[PDB]
Symmetry: D2
Amino acid sequence: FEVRPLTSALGAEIHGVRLEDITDADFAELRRLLLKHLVIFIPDQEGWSAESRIAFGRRFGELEEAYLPHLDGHPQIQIIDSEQGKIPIWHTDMTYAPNPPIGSVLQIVDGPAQGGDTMWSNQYLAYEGLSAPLRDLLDGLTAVHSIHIPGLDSQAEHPVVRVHPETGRRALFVNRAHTSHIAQLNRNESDALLQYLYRFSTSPEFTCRYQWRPGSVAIWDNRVTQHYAVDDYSEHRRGLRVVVLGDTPSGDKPRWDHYRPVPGQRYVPDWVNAKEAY
Amino acid sequence: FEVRPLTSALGAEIHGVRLEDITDADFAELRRLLLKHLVIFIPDQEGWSAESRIAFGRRFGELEEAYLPHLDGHPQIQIIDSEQKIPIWHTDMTYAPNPPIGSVLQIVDGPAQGGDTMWSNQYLAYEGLSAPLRDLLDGLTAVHSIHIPGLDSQAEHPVVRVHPETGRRALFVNRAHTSHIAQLNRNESDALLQYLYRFSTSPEFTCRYQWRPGSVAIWDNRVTQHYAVDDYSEHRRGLRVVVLGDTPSGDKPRWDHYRPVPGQRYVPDWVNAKEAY
Amino acid sequence: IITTAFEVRPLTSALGAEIHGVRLEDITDADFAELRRLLLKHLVIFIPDQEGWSAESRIAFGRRFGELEEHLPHLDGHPQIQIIDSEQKIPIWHTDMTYAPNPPIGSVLQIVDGPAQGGDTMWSNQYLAYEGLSAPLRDLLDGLTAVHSIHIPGLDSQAEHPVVRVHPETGRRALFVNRAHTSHIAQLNRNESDALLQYLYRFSTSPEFTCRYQWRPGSVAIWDNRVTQHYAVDDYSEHRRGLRVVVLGDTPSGDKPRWDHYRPVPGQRYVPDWVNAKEAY
Amino acid sequence: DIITTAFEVRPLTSALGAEIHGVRLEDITDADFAELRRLLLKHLVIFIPDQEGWSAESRIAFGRRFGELEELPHLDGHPQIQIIDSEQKIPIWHTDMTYAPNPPIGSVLQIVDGPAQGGDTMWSNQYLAYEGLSAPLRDLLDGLTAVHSIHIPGLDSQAEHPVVRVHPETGRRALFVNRAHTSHIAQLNRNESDALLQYLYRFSTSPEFTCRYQWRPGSVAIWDNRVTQHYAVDDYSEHRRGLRVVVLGDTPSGDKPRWDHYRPVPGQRYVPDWVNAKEAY
Ligand code: NA
Ligand code: NA
Ligand code: NA
Ligand code: NA
């Protein structure tokens, strides 16, 4: 294939591939490129059949499946629609679950000519760019990730530094959208450290920004990336997505116990957040 | 009386007063001193009778009353008891449409050290802002709210309150109960409130009081914040009467409320945990 | 602004557009006028495949916008053509030379040697940064100025500019502060200034207001320095070399300030609320 | 585990500070001094009221019981007795002279002229600041050092000290950074250092860790500079004058650092995440 990296950190556009009837050997090459580049982009795949899209995702693992919008007859193929909302926050998908997805395949099938880019960030570089004392600290910490909305209540505890199962490389595994707090620190220390990590981890030297064209497919490794959907458009935007499951996140056993507050202790954040959203 | 200011900003201890049978004229002098000093301290009032305490508070206005812990037989005398703590800067109940105008608190049991209370002067917090920022705040309001089981209340108050008696302008936001400024978007609101909260509780604007059993504090909740230091494990018990008055008043806002778009999500710029303790 | 003469591919909604079907070497007056309209519309424009552009043509092109800056490594025999060379980087959001009373009105940059990936440049739209502020905050900023400064050996300069400037050619208002060179807002005390500028710097470089350009062989970027910031991503180790011409002549103008400068008292000390180290690298 | 029963002692807060009654410094005995020194180890700052008229010779002899005294404005004929004068202020949390390799052990200060209210001094307990950190963070800090520095006309000094020092006389660990003079943590990059120090500065001066002293006529404060910060409240306009003796001799000591100094790459630029102005007052 013809491979054109987007940035030094991550991302590559792959020309010369046809997903519809991809061979097992050509798939192995895509998998190798995904381990190298973390998110890959396959242009010009308009018309990709539902059965082929599902078979492709299933090469990676079991697919998430019917209370959410999906293609007729294919609970595996989720519909993302701007009119149904938008996610301008850095996140790693569903890390509030005990077993977050290991990756996704997304194709924007309707969208504006400009606007609605998606950015991804390289969590290997976010960890490696920390100085050695902080890497050593984070290796021994875990964090609670959680969500609390109508119809979905979930929390999970994950290592702050995840060992990728295939590469063995260590990646930061916190994200602003779903991480609540570091379990072995008090909440105020947690807020200060997470605030630094969130901003550092999404430095432009660690990211790439993709402009969607008709027919473009993005495949990303959700074990070692965050992503961000830019909210700079008003046109209708629709995507088809398949979501892949795998093993639970793994890292070092924590080197300290959970922080234990005293009875009646009140968390007073050092930084203001409003009590009412919109 | 013998009046000893605690700091330049606010606070004064008053000797030579006995609250139990205080005269109307001596009460008028206490009120004058409260408008001058914002919080006043009256030592050595052990044994103050419930009837006299209630009568004293009622000189200032209607008293709050029974779901709260209170002295048996006297729903107007609230109980602050460590075994039943508030280490956050706050102005009392500003999530209410009509927050109290002040309180009278007597620590009757407490440790020899630990458990101080601090107050801050919200006149000086406003006056210490530069002119462009004072002008901005004069035209803003803020939503104050609380959302707990059994108590859901919000209220919209001017960011700059005009004290009814002095006519002097005071900042009227506080970290405990203020949610957001209504005419700004939430992110702008967070940034401005963060600055105001820290500036308003600068040591140059505060006083710190060490309680001796029997001491009484009287404060004007229209123009102060306060903070209960959580540095003790011994039993601490206070008796409190809480006074009501008029709704907070300031300028009509100079802009409409900020209106988000239908799908808009608030993404804070600064981390707060999703789980408390 | 009507811009129908060329094939135009916008990069993001906020700003940026790649212009096809134009050759800079022998550009006509009509085609230049269209490029200038595209710059007023899109704030930064990208002209691909201009390898070999002659020095005389590059200078004549720049001079169609205004007087060129002369001095700062430059192409031998052409003081007007400045050299940006990685061997001899700027990963901080900035608007060029705003510590000067007359910052440049824009630049033309061509990366002639660079890596196949790495070294992107981002730009931000200061019109949108201002328009995205709520009305009370726009009203406040309209009446404020800020000091921009630099103090290094051989270059000490400061200038006071409106926080909100009008673009002279469009009449539209834009934010005019940037993290690299703005020091403080003149009518606030320093602590208030720090808090408000910190908010503005991050808000103004939100991804909804930016574009990110990957340089390819022969690419030329032209940007309006009056209403943008930009940022050079520092994610590469290969040699990177650009030729730049800089158009002089901006005079940032806005409303008369509505308050006097903040006046400290004798002996007053600035204590920042947020830590910065006392030693850099 | 220090017994201090000889005098009447009135602690100021749970964290630190105690007012000592029934002792006259002028002709203090060896036994009474030993008790005051125990009270200082226990309470970190002690206050001796009603000592108007304390003679210069007795003040110096008292200081010398603790160690060698520092020897610019000073009492005539007594270079050891420094004059502090509001007309010739410091509303910033600081530990004295930590930019020096050997900061002072402690000081003895008497405000001899001042307002009836205004000009309080606060102290903070750096043992409690460290002990209040969670175990992972205490473990991190135990292995770090920080550069402390000052760069003013006539005084350029820097020193590297453990972030966590052991008090040589109690064996207890205390935080050893302060906002005024600490620059950066040496084993972190500057941005990480800024974030961690900002948290520590605010946490370490929490009201639960401090005391606030109102000076009265004749008041003497004695503090241990090894395990405190302090802060002079700037809420007064009248003349305020103090007499101060400074005890030299500290060598802040802690664990061997567990990591090397952070090494930037050539040409690396420090870009703070938080704004500070470029110009003070
Ligand atoms: Na996502
Ligand atoms: Na209260
Ligand atoms: Na530039
Ligand atoms: Na000092």
